[PDB]
Prior knowledge:
The structure is cut from a larger assembly and holds two copies of chain A (25 residues), two copies of chain C (269 residues), three copies of chain E (250 residues) and one copy of chain H (177 residues). With 25 residues, chain A is mainly β. Chain A is 0% helix and 16% strand. Classes of the chains: A mainly beta (25), C mainly beta (269), E mainly beta (250), H mainly beta (177). The complex binds lauric acid (2 copies). Chains E, F, G: This is Capsid protein VP2.
Amino acid sequence: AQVSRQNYFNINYFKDAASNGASKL
Amino acid sequence: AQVSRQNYFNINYFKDAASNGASKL
Amino acid sequence: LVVPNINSSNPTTSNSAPALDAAETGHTSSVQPEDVIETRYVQTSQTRDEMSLESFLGRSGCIHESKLEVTLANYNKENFTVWAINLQEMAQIRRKFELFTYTRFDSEITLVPCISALSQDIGHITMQYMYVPPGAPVPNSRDDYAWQSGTNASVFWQHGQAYPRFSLPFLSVASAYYMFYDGYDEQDQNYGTANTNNMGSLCSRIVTEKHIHKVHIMTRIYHKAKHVKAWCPRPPRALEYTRAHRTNFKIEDRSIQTAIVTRPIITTA
Amino acid sequence: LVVPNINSSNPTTSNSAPALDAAETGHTSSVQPEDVIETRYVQTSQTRDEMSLESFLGRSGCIHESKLEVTLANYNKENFTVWAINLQEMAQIRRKFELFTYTRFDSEITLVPCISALSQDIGHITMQYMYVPPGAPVPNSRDDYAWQSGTNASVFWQHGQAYPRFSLPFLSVASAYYMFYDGYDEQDQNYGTANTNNMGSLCSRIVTEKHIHKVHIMTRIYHKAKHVKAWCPRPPRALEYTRAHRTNFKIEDRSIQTAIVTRPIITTA
Amino acid sequence: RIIQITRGDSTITSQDVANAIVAYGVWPHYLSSKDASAIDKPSQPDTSSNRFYTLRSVTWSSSSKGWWWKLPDALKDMGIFGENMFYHYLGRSGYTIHVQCNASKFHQGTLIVALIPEHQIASALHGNVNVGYNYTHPGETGREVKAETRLNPDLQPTEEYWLNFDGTLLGNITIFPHQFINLRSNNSATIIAPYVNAVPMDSMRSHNNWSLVIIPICPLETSSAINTIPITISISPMCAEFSGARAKRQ
Amino acid sequence: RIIQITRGDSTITSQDVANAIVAYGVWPHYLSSKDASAIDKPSQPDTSSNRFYTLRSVTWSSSSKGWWWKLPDALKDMGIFGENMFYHYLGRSGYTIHVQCNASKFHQGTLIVALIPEHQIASALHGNVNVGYNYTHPGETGREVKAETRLNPDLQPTEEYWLNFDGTLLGNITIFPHQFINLRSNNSATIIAPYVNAVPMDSMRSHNNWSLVIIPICPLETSSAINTIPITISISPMCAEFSGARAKRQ
Amino acid sequence: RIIQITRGDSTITSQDVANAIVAYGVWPHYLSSKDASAIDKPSQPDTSSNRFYTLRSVTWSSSSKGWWWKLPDALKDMGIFGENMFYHYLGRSGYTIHVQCNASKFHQGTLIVALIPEHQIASALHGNVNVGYNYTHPGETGREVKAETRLNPDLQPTEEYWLNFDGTLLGNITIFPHQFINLRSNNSATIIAPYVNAVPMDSMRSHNNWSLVIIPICPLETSSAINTIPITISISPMCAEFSGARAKRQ
Amino acid sequence: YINSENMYSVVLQSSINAPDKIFSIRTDVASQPLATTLIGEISSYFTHWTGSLRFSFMFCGTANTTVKLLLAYTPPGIAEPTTRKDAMLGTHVIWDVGLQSTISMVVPWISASHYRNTSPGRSTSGYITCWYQTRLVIPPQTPPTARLLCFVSGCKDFCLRMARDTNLHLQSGAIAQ
Ligand SMILES: CCCCCCCCCCCC(=O)O
Ligand SMILES: CCCCCCCCCCCC(=O)O
């Protein structure tokens, strides 16, 4: 799963909701 | 192999049954 | 996330005045550059991304430095710290959040252990950090059974191990952390955010057993807010913070010093 | 994993009483909020996930701290520890599991070596940890051939190497680890879980050869239960544990102190 | 440029207003079957409660520096509302706040009318003091900005208005739901406020969700005979809800 | 032969009852858009009001001759209901009357429980006397049948129970909504009463639509240690409605 | 609200019971071809074994504090069952436990009847003592809660009932298969127990899979002539299975 | 009664002829004395909780013995009700003992917030008072006292979170191998 900001990959290696990186907008 | 909890990847890098992470429910 | 652009404007001679309004309404008057001046036409790139909530509080800051002083002798008796958890302790941080009446978010806690050596050597030091929830048994010795952490969350750090850090799911029992609280106790007491934002407490203790070298542990604690929402913005803090969980601010025998710089005369800045 | 929601309830005037039951049955009486009170209607989010077996015992805790004291002189003769393996040694843990009559699960063992320095220097220290099964030859010296670990499982740790840790497949020769045991020996002796839960023993020994600096090794052992099932829940332990593999609890010249707090009068808590 | 507000068995007018403003832009409503936690049939007294309740007029002069009241509480004595308030542990509501104050074409002066959420004031003192329940619970009278020694300054809120009472600057107050009464333009202000707070309902007693604040930003000047005018306050709660039916607390 | 009655945040039981009886056979309801005359939005406090209100237990003995209370009034102090009662001119409601009284297989005795409409009692005197407001407005305590001189017998209701208090014979009392508590059979009675009266709503104060009456038709006899048992009363109003919102009368 | 239990050549009744309860909710059965490890043709004596075996009635008084027996063992002398028990190394079974105890409408008192798995009691002493085989192997008589010095307290189980004998609080005992005999309501309890234990079968001698426990939670009070009633116990094993056929051990 | 069964029972008098309190307890699951009960003890391993509670009461007196109690939960925000009036204005349940020994009744989760602290400060979940509705009544020849038991369990509703170490139990000084 990869995207476009202001291309890169980023799935969540972690099982818990909080574990995850910074949100999008 | 990736899923949804309370999306992330997780195969088992390990050959033995016990080696594996915490179970699901 | 983009900013609107600026449109050519023209020599208005309208019976309609947009510039004239009334603030009484309680509204911010809707007037844009073009409205008032024959303007250019500008394609704006400018980005508010950074001006995003998560972009603001989404930065790691310090909230607490918990210094533990190693005492060889009564080793298994002292040599443990406690900290009632909260953010109200470290202005920088505090102020930001204190920007809004409520906030909701998960927390990424990051640690920075510092060993100030005292004997000519450090040796091998191992720290433990048990997050202790309200109700959980509080450790009372460097050897309290409590550090068996059979259900509690504890994280270990030793000399040479890289900065520890973990993640924490928005706690509280209500939709959001209260930044302020116009209310009291079930016992009409403690007018303060203090009523609610008991989160439990953080505890550290050196594991390394009775040894030789007197030394000091200076674990600093750092916090990034994740997955953020907030409501009801409030004016910023104007002066120094006195105490936690209180808005108080009047200081022992000293001026009420704002931030406003004074001047000689208004007809010159 | 969700909790049911709450349904609007209404002014019952039934010939049918659900609230009236009899505990004699041995059953927990089936009555829900609505049954007894004109209730609201609530959409419940609340999650029992965390309230999951694996979520409980699925946390790493300490079960044993095995302190080894380096003695320069007779170096190759002592300087090795032993530990008869079991969980019955470290309340926190013990109590939880002691929640059920049987448990089955694999184990993740995590290690925490701590070098308490004694000479002005540590030098280079290397530990070995041989898991020694029941029947396997027990080491009797810092240099027992046994530490050739030709079939045994041994794991090495040195100063600077990050916490070691490994995984272990549910052992035993029956479907589950016995938490309790209302039985004796083939020789009517030892009424205790002790009959079964011999797992063999854990052994450590510093590899680093005869050297200079007297020092101490404080390897702490930590255990997370994985892939968990359990049956027949029992009441929790009420007081302190006396000894392992025994339910005993009466203590040398001291009160039978529960946890119940006493009060003045029932018509006031 | 006019206005007629009706609630319960009560109706307000004002021959001249700035178009009232809505709290954070959310018209008040009952509690969501989805959000609720009070698992019992809430009581909604409706026309009896959700009506207009007129306060105790305070007197503005060329010397007045400010006043405030906290919500709920204020209307702790006002009919069923008040009653229902104590008789139930929990309650929820939003209100319509209508602040009125006439004068004449021959006066000048300006008031900031501002409703504040979780308005935590600050005791006026150095070190471990707090605020005394009794003091943030004035009732209909409210607090005046009186600068002249109190019986227990150990639990007195700051009498420092311009600091919004909490270490924030007046003037960065507009960040809240607010209007201005500017005698020369309007003669009354109005605000409608939904329930705001991080839980479905909260204790009517232990806590004040709100906090109205008025301040003469612009001193009441006049060459007229009357140099002291009154400021009346009228409030209607809306969507009045109570759970936890029991005895009346005191 | 059992029973569980739930109202507001309150629930009653009785492991043994005679199947409660409905007032005149009409289950209570709100006011008809067609009948109403109160041209204002009535207030319906619902779970808060329409709940169970337990009285003040009176003591029955081998010597007790009777008691009564009047409705409304009785519950003039009982939460919102009471409050809403005075704060509004007009009100309407029906109630659930549950009279409970346990004893034992080793007692005997019988009580007539009867709810009376427009129950006009008669002062106990010869010529131009009337009854004194205060006396037909006892509150939760009710009137006991005390035969021993009163402070102002000039306005005392007759203490003549067997005459139903009004020149009608007890025994032709059953013509009203009634049950019997016969210790040897049941242990509590119950009645549900709609609004009855020749107008939509009436003054909660000036008038009592109802009037419960109990009478030991059959003396409490026993060889048991306890020869005095209590009689508790619990009442839930239903479909609570008030119009004419104003100040609280005293 | 009745009951008739039949097993082998034996049948029980009880004109009044609380509907018996099943162990962990699993009706007993023979050993799974899939689970078994005993690689020999098990013996199933059936009607001869799987029958009702009545114990030795123990006497309850206003002073009795508790009793227990362990299963198997208890029925170590009871016909084929007992015999087959020793003659085979291994055995498996579940049982039907029927605890009966009549009294009268004129008594009061309450017993907790609870079946416990792997019930490891605790010797009543400080430091390295254990429990003595002989003491957790009473037979049909069971253990009484006798608080008065034993011949070898060095291997005596705690006589501390309320601590469930094992450092768990009585009252958190219900977490086990249990019923209550409450004289005023029922007059006997019943429980059916499957084989529970972490292996197919286990030594009939070396180990007691179970452990019944009774405790007068509520003291036997009465004004009646008989102030001491007996408590009888009757047990039927079910699905009786033995492997490891050899000589009879002693 | 502290180290006997008798702490689990409550006694009632045939001699009491009035609206008298009989006992009361805080509601918080890990409140005393609940704390030590299964649920309480379990809760004592988490920091948060929410749900309704199921309290059950069993009469034990002779079969011929009658009574009518009043079980009342009073919402926090106020203090222990002193009179029966004061009590019954809250959520309650009039219990008639007749044939079925028991009578379960519920403590509706009624919080300002969603979850609550397993370990409470000065904050409460109200209490559960117990009153004489009638009078414990017996015949001639009968025990004049009555045992009354009390249990607790969580409703379809109940739920815990935030895993943490238990306090209802400790270890000071090592265990012997
Ligand atoms: C063990 C790590 C502790 C980190 C806690 C972050 C929680 C923030 C709660 C905000 C409460 C406050 O300060 O008002
Ligand atoms: C070498 C690592 C040892 C870890 C052993 C975990 C096995 C747990 C067995 C439980 C037996 C008991 O304590 O009753």
